[PDB]
UniProtKB/TrEMBL annotation, chain B:
Protein name as annotated: Putative tail protein
Full protein stretch here: 157 to 519 of 778
Top-level taxon: Viruses
Organism: Shigella phage Buco
């Protein structure tokens, strides 16, 4: 049945992809010219006509749209859209304007003192408590009384009353510019923050007054990476959090295709621990471009300019390290690879047990025999051969068939032969040597019908034609049949994708709607 | 610890109100100071002062030198005394495990505390008054037991339901729900080396070694071996795992549009457990594949009205490399409908397949 999707003016502007949802399926259909997405049933019946989205508009269509399905979620990526990062210090206070002093133990014949220095001024408060024999000394030796007296002395020194708050034995200083809380008392009686830096996690107050709901402190022994902690007054506990003025949320990310047949944007998480020194920005944040998407074992893959970024195992929107104390497994993965020519990764494919990442002038393989952690994650190039990585390679039989340009006016295909002895050795040999001048233009789409051992390729040379590949693998991994015949359709084809039994062709209808041809 | 020339104090703050109790004990030379300096007397005096402050009597209980506060809303116990003399819970958070009381009164039989140094994952502990010991337990409002699980066929010839264990340590942040709890569907079952396997939507979950009903981490302090295994794999198309098979030394997990192998040469732990796809070929994984001779024969649909079989050839050189080639190429229109069952007679080297095309026939 003819779909209610209007004809795309550009010859290559329609993107189609089948998604299996349990025993039933769906036919995603996107018009790149206007961004008007569309969802169809297993055979020509629209379920929810997804509204147009400006994210899906691109100058070049049918090849800048990439999809990756992980768990029950499907993500649609546009490579012509640059993500934008937002820094929203909402519930975080400035560490340079905050400080605290806590009393751990109380002595009798002691002079209590505290100094507060900042850009506004330097204030010193001194409180003296007498021996136990003195009248009214036991009540005045308590930590709460000492803290109250110290606050009163600080106020009398000249510091404004709107800058110090206290609840029990804990004092909080706020509203300054470069506050540095210190004390001449011993370290066995009182604790101070200096420049919001404490020795260990045990030194954190965890009982600051209500005026400190975003206080930030750094835990370290002057020889560790910056580990920041934030205070939550509701639970009276300190939680790890990213430093002040850090990326908290990034928008313009690839949209989400949830269980319900609706495509909606989904914001991605920002930095959650440490700073840019120990928790560096991933490939797609340091570089504003995103080139290709993939779904490896449990993690979402976002290739961005020769840099591969893998999210957390359980969380696909977390591309930043969740902790800094230890390099946890099942966490962010950020790796890169160098090349002779400055090429970028565009297409990633999940082969038998390894993730093969393709580029315009470089091909790399990521080993997947064992579970990969950020400690042991690395990428090494296999061969730096010219490639038309803009189109997603497809696994044919036992090998990968990816496009290439042998001339400025013609294309070709290369076969990514896997070694039959070693686990992760790959060799690439040209498969269309006997057909140099046979695929005019460039290859626009690749699909494989795994049940009939046939592959269809759509090229830009003849819009009404389509190349057909027939393969049959015999014993000892010997290709018994290789066929490269051609098919001709009455109408110009826009996009095509295969299913469990049949391959669907979307042609340019004579009226104002595209037709779904199955065979 | 107990001091002599000290002012004992405690503050209790919650939604109901804020209460502060102050008790003063004199020097050793004072009359009746040694008896009053004991921890029990100080605790009793502090409780009396708290009651006099206005807090209801039904909210504080004590046995020895340990005080328990209950019945509040957001209680936060603090103290201005030094850390070398008294210990408090704040928001049920202590520094280390040694700070746990382990001697709370009988009114606290389910008290929960979190052990951490403000830089560790949430580790929760529960108090058992019967043994006066603190045992690790999952956080409040956590999955404790899951029903409607696969039934049990015990030694006696009776099939009975068996409940599966819930979360036993930590929270959902460090002890995440497995594949079949986050996703309500379960697609396929298997039994790998010592562990029960419950595939659920491209997610493989393996129970503990000795316990087949434990699909949650039993501890959070260290990632113990012989524990829960929860791994996942991505695919070009959003397919799910349906059938898992135990081949020569590896667990092969099949899906509608993806085939994966789990290495079993070495014992697998949650640290080193990972799954990688071998080939994303179309498959009729709904039926369980069967090992024929030295290879695996699994079903497939070459057409909407006919089926076929694919052979999962293992490599003869590398330990865990597999290549799949179609075995029924010469018989395209020979198996009408879909394959419904597969069986192998390993002694006679014969295999029988039941297909939906002809109900009275068998391949």
């Amino acid at each position: 049945a003819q779909t209610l999707m209007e004809n795309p003016v550009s010859p290559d502007a329609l993107f189609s992809t089948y998604i299996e949802r349990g025993t039933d399926g769906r036919h995603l259909l996107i018009n790149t010219e206007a961004g008007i997405w569309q969802i169809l049933s297993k055979d020509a019946t629209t379920l929810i006509r997804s509204g147009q989205a400006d994210y899906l508009k691109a100058s070049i269509g049918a090849t800048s749209i990439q999809t990756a399905s992980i768990a029950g979620l499907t993500y649609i990526l546009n490579t012509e859209q640059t993500p934008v990062a937002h820094v929203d210090n909402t519930g975080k206070l400035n560490p340079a304007n905050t400080g605290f002093f806590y009393i751990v133990a109380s002595s009798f014949s002691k002079r209590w003192t505290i100094t507060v220095q900042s850009n506004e001024g330097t204030w010193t408060a001194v409180h003296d408590v007498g021996a136990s024999s003195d009248d009214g000394a036991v009540p005045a030796a308590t930590a709460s009384a000492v803290i109250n007296s110290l606050k009163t002395n600080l106020l009398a020194a000249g510091m404004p009353s709107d800058k110090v708050d206290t609840f029990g034995s804990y004092m909080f200083i706020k509203g300054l510019t470069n506050v540095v809380v210190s004390s001449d008392a011993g370290t066995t009686y009182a604790r101070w923050s200096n420049q919001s830096r404490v020795d260990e996690e045990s030194d954190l107050p965890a009982q600051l007054p209500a005026s400190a709901n975003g206080c930030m402190c750094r835990v370290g022994a002057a020889s560790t990476s910056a580990t920041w902690y934030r205070f939550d007054y509701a639970t009276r506990q300190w939680n790890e959090d990213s430093a002040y003025s850090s990326i908290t949320k990034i928008t313009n990310m690839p949209l989400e295709f949830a269980a319900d047949d609706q495509i909606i944007p989904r914001d991605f998480e920002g930095r959650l621990a440490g700073d840019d020194e120990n928790n560096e920005d991933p490939g797609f944040v340091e570089n504003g471009y995103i080139t290709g998407i993939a779904a490896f074992q449990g993690r979402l893959v976002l290739l961005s300019g020769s840099r591969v970024s893998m999210s957390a195992s359980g969380l696909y929107q977390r591309f930043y390290r969740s902790t800094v104390v230890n390099l946890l497994d099942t966490d962010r993965i950020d790796i890169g690879a160098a090349s002779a020519q400055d090429s970028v990764f565009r297409a990633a494919l999940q082969f038998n047990r390894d993730l093969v990442v393709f580029g315009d002038s470089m091909q790399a393989v990521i080993a997947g025999n064992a579970v990969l952690t950020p400690t042991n994650a690395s990428i090494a190039l296999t061969s730096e051969f010219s490639c038309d990585s803009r189109v997603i390679p497809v696994v044919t039989g036992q090998t990968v068939l990816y496009a290439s340009r042998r001339n400025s006016d013609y294309a070709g295909l290369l076969e990514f032969i896997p070694s039959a002895y070693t686990s992760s050795q790959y060799v690439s040999q040209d498969a269309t040597v006997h057909l140099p001048r046979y695929i005019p233009g460039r290859v626009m789409d690749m699909q494989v019908s795994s049940v009939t051992n046939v592959a269809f390729f759509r090229y830009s040379g003849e819009r009404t034609s389509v190349l057909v590949y027939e393969f049959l693998w015999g014993e000892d991994a010997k290709r018994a049949q290789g066929a490269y015949h051609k098919w001709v359709l009455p109408y110009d084809v826009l996009s095509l994708h295969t299913l469990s039994e049949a391959a669907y062709f979307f042609v340019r209808g004579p009226g104002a709607y595209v037709l779904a041809l199955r065979v």
